[PDB]
Amino acid sequence: SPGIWQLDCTHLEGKVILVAVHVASGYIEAEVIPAETGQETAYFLLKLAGRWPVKTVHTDNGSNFTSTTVKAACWWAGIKQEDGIPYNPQSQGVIESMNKELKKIIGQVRDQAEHLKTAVQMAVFIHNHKRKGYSAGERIVDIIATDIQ
Amino acid sequence: SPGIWQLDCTHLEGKVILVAVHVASGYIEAEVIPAETGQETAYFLLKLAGRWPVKTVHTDNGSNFTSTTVKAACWWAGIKQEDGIPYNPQSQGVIESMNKELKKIIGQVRDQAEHLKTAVQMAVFIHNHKRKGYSAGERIVDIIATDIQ
Ligand SMILES: C=CCN(Cc1ccccc1C(=O)NCc1ccco1)Cc1ccc2c(c1C(=O)O)OC[C@H](CCC(=O)O)O2
Ligand SMILES: C=CCN(Cc1ccccc1C(=O)NCc1ccco1)Cc1ccc2c(c1C(=O)O)OC[C@H](CCC(=O)O)O2
Ligand SMILES: [Cl-]
Ligand SMILES: [Cl-]
C-alpha cells in the first residue's frame, strides 16, 4: 500500500496532463507534455521514483504497459510495472472524479498564469493541500513514515 | 526546521542544474534549465511547494532574492522567501560537497542517457536513496511526519 501508484492521463487545451496518484492517500504529481509517448512517461516515472518510494506503478494504458522505454525506466528505478485494469470498479470512478476536480481547479487558476503548465502546478498544490481533516500531502507522509517505522 | 529548504545552482555541460535541498534531511529535488532566470526559479518553487510543505526557502543568490517573479511564486505558494547568507559557515561547505557528490553521480550514470536532464534525475534518485543507517528520503518523511504528529 505505501508504495502503490497509479498513472492517469487527461487532456486539456490540446495538451496532455500526465498524473501519478498515490493510491492510499490521493496525493498527486503531474506534468503537462505535448503528447503521451513512452519516453515522456519513462522520464516522468524516473522523476517520481527519485522523490517518493515507488514500489509499484499501475500504468494508465496498454501502450505504456507495453513500451520498452517505460519498462526500462521501471527497471532502472526499481519499480514493479503493472497493468491498470480496474478489478475494483471503484477505481474508474475515483480517477474520473479526480480528473474532473483537477480540471475545475485549473479553471479557477487559469487566468493567474500565461502557460497551462503553471496552472497545472497550481492545481497540484491546491489538490495536495486541501483538507478533506487531513490533506493528501499529510496522508502520504504519515502512510510512508508508519511503513518506515 | 521540517519546512526549511535551500536553493542551490550549479553548472554542467553548459547548462544549469537548479537544486532544492531540504536542510534537516539532505533530501533533494533538481532540474536542468538553460539558464537561471526568475521565471525558471519561480516555476521550480511552485512545483516543490505543491509536493512538500515548504515553509521557508533560502534563495541561492541575490538575483533570485530580488526577483519579483520569484517573490510572486513565494507569495502564491505561501513560502517565506529568505536570503541564503551562510551565517553558519558550515552551510557553504555542505552545499559545495553536495554539488561535488551530485556531479560525481552524474558522471557515473552519464552514459545511461542521451540527455543531461535524465542523468540528473538518475542522480537525484541515487542521492535520495543512498543509506548513510537511513536515506535522505527516509529522513525527510520521518521529520515531516513527526511534525504533523
Ligand atoms: C528511448 C530512448 C531514450 N533513452 C534511451 C537511452 C539512450 C542512451 C543511453 C541509454 C538509454 C537508456 O535506455 N537508458 C536507461 C533508461 C531508460 C529510461 C530510464 O533509464 C533514455 C531516455 C528516456 C527518457 C528520456 C530521455 C532519455 C535519454 O536518453 O536521456 O531523455 C529525456 C526525455 C525527456 C522526456 C521527453 O522529452 O520525452 O526522457
Ligand atoms: C513574470 C512572468 C511569469 N508569469 C506572470 C503571470 C502572467 C499572467 C498571469 C499571471 C502571472 C503571475 O504573475 N502569476 C502569479 C505567479 C507568478 C509565479 C507564480 O505565480 C507567471 C509564470 C511564472 C513562471 C512560469 C510561468 C508563468 C506563466 O505565466 O505561466 O510559465 C511557465 C514558466 C516555465 C519556466 C520557464 O519557462 O522559465 O514559469
Ligand atoms: Cl503538501
Ligand atoms: Cl526515495
Side-chain angles (χ1 to χ4, degrees):
Chain A
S1 202
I4 296 178
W5 294 72
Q6 171 75 57
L7 290 176
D8 161 48
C9 183
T10 191
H11 300 69
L12 200 60
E13 288 180 28
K15 293 180 196 63
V16 168
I17 302 169
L18 186 52
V19 181
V21 193
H22 185 256
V23 173
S25 67
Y27 170 94
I28 71 170
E29 302 228 355
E31 65 171 19
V32 177
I33 56 180
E36 193 204 43
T37 65
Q39 192 148 160
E40 290 281 14
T41 302
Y43 184 68
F44 184 74
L45 289 173
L46 177 58
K47 295 193 285 179
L48 183 67
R51 285 153 178 79
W52 293 100
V54 178
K55 179 201 174 182
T56 299
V57 166
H58 295 275
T59 52
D60 55 321
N61 56 51
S63 293
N64 277 335
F65 187 61
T66 300
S67 170
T68 50
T69 305
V70 180
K71 289 180 188 300
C74 289
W75 165 76
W76 199 96
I79 298 164
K80 292 193 181 190
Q81 187 212 38
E82 292 188 0
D83 64 61
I85 296 163
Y87 293 103
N88 184 337
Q90 295 259 63
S91 304
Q92 274 173 268
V94 169
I95 294 160
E96 158 231 77
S97 287
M98 190 199 61
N99 289 342
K100 183 171 153 168
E101 186 226 36
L102 284 177
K103 289 174 178 179
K104 181 176 195 69
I105 301 167
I106 295 165
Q108 291 181 303
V109 298
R110 191 65 190 82
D111 70 317
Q112 292 179 58
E114 179 179 344
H115 299 105
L116 179 59
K117 61 195 294 176
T118 313
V120 169
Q121 301 306 326
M122 288 175 170
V124 171
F125 182 109
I126 287 164
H127 173 83
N128 286 340
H129 287 259
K130 181 84 162 203
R131 287 176 191 281
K132 288 293 201 293
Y134 294 100
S135 65
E138 288 166 333
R139 294 188 297 263
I140 189 172
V141 173
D142 175 49
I143 288 159
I144 298 176
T146 304
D147 189 61
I148 295 167
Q149 311 322 322
Chain B
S1 89
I4 294 168
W5 294 73
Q6 170 74 59
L7 286 182
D8 159 48
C9 180
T10 191
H11 299 73
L12 202 64
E13 287 177 28
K15 287 178 201 64
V16 167
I17 299 167
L18 187 51
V19 183
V21 191
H22 183 256
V23 173
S25 67
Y27 171 92
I28 72 170
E29 302 224 0
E31 67 170 12
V32 175
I33 56 180
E36 192 204 42
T37 64
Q39 272 195 64
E40 289 283 10
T41 303
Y43 183 67
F44 181 75
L45 287 174
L46 178 57
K47 292 193 285 178
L48 183 70
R51 287 154 177 77
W52 295 99
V54 179
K55 182 196 157 172
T56 299
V57 63
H58 293 277
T59 48
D60 55 323
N61 56 51
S63 292
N64 277 336
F65 186 62
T66 304
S67 167
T68 51
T69 307
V70 177
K71 285 178 191 302
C74 288
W75 165 78
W76 198 95
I79 298 168
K80 188 175 181 195
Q81 187 211 218
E82 292 186 0
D83 65 55
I85 299 165
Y87 292 105
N88 184 333
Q90 294 223 304
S91 305
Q92 244 178 108
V94 165
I95 294 156
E96 292 168 357
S97 296
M98 187 195 61
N99 286 343
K100 279 199 55 225
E101 185 225 41
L102 282 176
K103 288 178 185 180
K104 176 188 153 184
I105 302 167
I106 295 162
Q108 291 173 344
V109 302
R110 193 58 190 88
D111 76 320
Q112 292 177 58
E114 176 154 27
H115 300 107
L116 179 61
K117 64 195 292 181
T118 312
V120 168
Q121 300 308 324
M122 286 175 170
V124 169
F125 182 109
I126 285 160
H127 175 85
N128 286 339
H129 283 81
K130 178 78 169 186
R131 294 186 181 279
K132 267 178 56 187
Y134 299 90
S135 66
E138 290 167 332
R139 291 192 295 267
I140 186 170
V141 168
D142 179 47
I143 288 163
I144 299 174
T146 306
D147 190 57
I148 297 166
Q149 272 61 255

